[PDB]
């Protein structure tokens, strides 16, 4: 029972790309030819990835081989198809039309099998909706390794909604999907690296228009993406903070502005700042918005945006009293880049320059962002 199969090279290159992003045994990939499919298994300390791709199975069997060596070779081969043949002397032959590679294999019995999940809840959502909630929350995870519980994305069902939420203490990001069926409340914290891997998977063109099944338990999360890709992940063992208290419940005024002109202007003005004072200042009035910054021993900068009801230059602030408030420009940019929207809204809770600011994008009612100001 020796593996032998013919595979479309471009298909194998894509699967190996996912395997590379997962990672002595962790350096290997397990290849299993069975029932018309090649199953590729990859694992590290926190993730187990199993991918099935259709191939011509000429003989069923299993081998394991270096992930890096296999990937490096296959992505340099110009043949539209490759033959993979397990040979007697613990070697995998990779054959193109004019070239042949023989790779040392390692015992299949040394490669770990996947663990299992006893889900508390399971549900199906579209890959496109799941990609959105991860894209809207992955950037505001804490990188402070002491804040163990903030080092991932909180995925939780509450009422009929599936939320992703993240915070680092300076900003909060929330994005959700409505679930049709009744599902009990449950939550887990997905590690950053697992969020990055599952995002790459669902965004693949083969999967982005399909569905992903999600299974949650107290100690694991399992993704089944478009039937043929399974990702099992450990969780962060912590309790996510109750962030509902962080969300402003009322506003005294709001800024509405063309998202691109706002993002581009923040980026230009922020160039003058120094690491010790990463801050830009917004001076808001009905007639104009001034964006300014200073940098010690560097200089200063300002840009003026004038009131406009035209979509491409939109600026309005319907309040008689002006407001001056500051923000970390990187944190504002993170939000503005997360949602492809023509306009963005900033809601101010009170006249102070210290209260949290709520950010929403019109036409995107299932994304909420909160950013703390900085003194300027």
């Amino acid at each position: 029972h020796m593996l032998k199969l013919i595979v479309e090279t471009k298909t194998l290159v894509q699967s190996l790309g996912f395997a590379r992003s997962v990672v002595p045994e962790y350096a290997n990939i397990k290849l299993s030819a069975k029932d018309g499919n090649l199953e590729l298994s990859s694992t590290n300390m926190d993730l187990y990835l199993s991918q099935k791709i259709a191939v011509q199975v000429l003989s069923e069997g299993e081998i394991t081989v270096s992930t890096q060596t296999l990937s490096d070779i296959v992505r340099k081969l110009p043949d539209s198809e490759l033959t993979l043949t397990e040979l007697d002397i613990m070697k995998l032959e990779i054959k193109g039309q004019n070239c042949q590679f023989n790779l040392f294999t390692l015992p299949v019995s040394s490669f770990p099998a996947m663990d299992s999940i006893k889900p508390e809840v399971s549900f199906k959502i579209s890959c496109a909706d799941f990609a959105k909630i991860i894209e809207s929350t992955k950037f505001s995870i804490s990188l402070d390794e002491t804040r163990y519980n903030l080092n991932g994305i909180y995925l939780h069902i509450k009422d009929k909604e599936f939320f992703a939420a993240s915070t680092d203490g300076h900003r909060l990001s929330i994005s959700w999907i409505t679930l049709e069926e009744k599902i009990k409340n449950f939550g887990v914290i997905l590690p950053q690296k697992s969020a990055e891997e599952i995002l790459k998977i669902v965004k693949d063109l083969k999967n982005i228009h399909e569905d992903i099944e999600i299974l949650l338990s107290s100690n694991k999360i399992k993704f089944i993406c478009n039937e043929n890709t399974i990702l099992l992940s450990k969780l962060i063992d912590g309790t996510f903070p109750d962030y509902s208290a962080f969300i402003p419940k009322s506003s005294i005024s709001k800024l509405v502005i063309n998202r691109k002109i706002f993002a581009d202007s923040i980026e230009r003005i922020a160039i003058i700042t120094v690491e010790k004072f990463r801050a830009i200042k917004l001076s808001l009035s009905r007639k104009t918005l001034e964006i300014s910054a200073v940098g010690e021993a560097r200089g200063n900068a300002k840009e003026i945006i004038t009131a406009s009801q035209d979509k491409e230059s939109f600026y309005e602030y319907n309040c008689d009293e002006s407001l001056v408030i500051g923000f970390n420009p990187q944190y504002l940019e993170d939000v503005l880049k997360a949602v492809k929207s023509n306009l963005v809204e900033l809601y101010f809770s009170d006249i102070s320059a210290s209260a949290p600011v709520l950010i929403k994008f019109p036409q995107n009612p299932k994304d909420i962002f909160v950013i703390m100001p900085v003194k300027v």
Binding site: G169, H170, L172, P241, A245, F246, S354, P356, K375
Partner: peptide, 10 residues
């Protein structure tokens, strides 16, 4: 650089 009202943490 004030934080969100995280208790504890701020």
């Amino acid at each position: 650089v004030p934080t969100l009202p995280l208790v504890p943490x701020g």
